[PDB]
Structure formats: structure tokens, C-alpha cells
Ligand binder design. Structure first.
Ligand SMILES: CCCCCCCCCCCCCCCC(=O)OC[C@H](COP(=O)(O)OCCN)OC(=O)CCCCCCCCCCCCCCC
Lengths: 48, 49
């Protein structure tokens, strides 16, 4: 009923390992770019 | 700079600047520390200009 059983499990292992690499690296790219904004500071100095 | 002999400038220097302290303090000689450059941005938004 499921001849692809063994091959799919081997692929599943490779998918988990690559995601375990790519998820934190891509997450790191997101935070790298966004850090410009996340640490930005604002000040309001209207004339009086 | 101009019409003048370097001799007379030196004479006027020993005449009017010899009375100057050339002896620094014991350890109060100012030294310039290097100044950290920082990649950064400052934006003063003022649309009235
Ligand atoms: C004309 C082409 C159209 C393509 C359209 C695709 C649409 C996007 C679908 C996204 C599928 C995710 C990856 C499937 C992995 C797989 O199934 O690959 C199985 C293979 C092992 O295979 P194996 O054991 O046979 O050894 C192979 C023989 N040497 O390792 C993997 O798991 C690699 C996948 C790593 C984990 C996923 C990372 C996702 C990155 C996204 C990149 C998407 C590219 C986009 C292309 C258009």
C-alpha cells in the first residue's frame, strides 16, 4: 500500500536537518535587517 | 606671511612670547584619544521647512 515508506522517511530526516539549519539562519537574516528599526530611538522637540 | 624677514619675526617672538610657560604639568599633558566612528543615522523630520 505504501512502497515509498522507506524513501519518504529518509527524506523526512533530511528535511528536519535542513530546517534546523535554515530556520535559525533565515530568522537571523530577518533580525539583522530589522535591528535598524528595533533599536531606533525617537524624540519629540516641538517649538514652545 | 607677507613682506617681512623671518629674522624680525623670531626677534618679536623671543621679545613678546618668551614670557610663556613651556613646562607642562607633571602628568596633565592632554592626549587625544581616538574617536570611534559609528555607522548610524539621525533624521530630524521637519516638514515646515
Ligand atoms: C520546475 C520545478 C518546479 C519546482 C516547484 C517547487 C515548489 C516549492 C516546493 C517547496 C519544497 C520544499 C523542499 C522539498 C525537499 C525535498 O523533497 O527534497 C528531498 C531531499 C532528499 O532527496 P533524496 O533523499 O532523494 O536524496 C537526494 C539525492 N541527492 O532533501 C531535502 O529534503 C532538501 C530540502 C531541505 C528542507 C526544506 C528547505 C526548504 C527550502 C525552500 C527551497 C524551495 C525551492 C523553490 C523551488 C521553486
Amino acid at each position: 500500500a505504501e512502497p515509498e515508506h522507506d524513501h519518504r522517511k529518509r527524506m523526512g530526516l533530511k528535511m528536519l536537518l535542513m530546517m534546523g539549519l535554515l530556520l535559525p539562519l533565515v530568522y537571523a537574516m530577518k533580525r539583522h535587517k530589522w535591528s535598524v528599526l528595533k533599536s531606533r530611538k525617537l524624540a519629540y522637540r516641538p517649538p514652545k | 606671511a607677507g613682506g617681512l624677514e623671518h629674522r624680525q619675526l623670531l626677534d618679536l617672538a623671543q621679545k613678546h612670547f618668551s614670557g610663556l610657560s613651556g613646562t607642562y604639568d607633571e602628568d596633565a599633558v592632554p592626549t587625544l584619544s581616538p574617536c570611534r566612528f559609528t555607522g548610524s543615522q539621525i533624521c530630524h523630520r521637519e516638514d515646515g521647512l
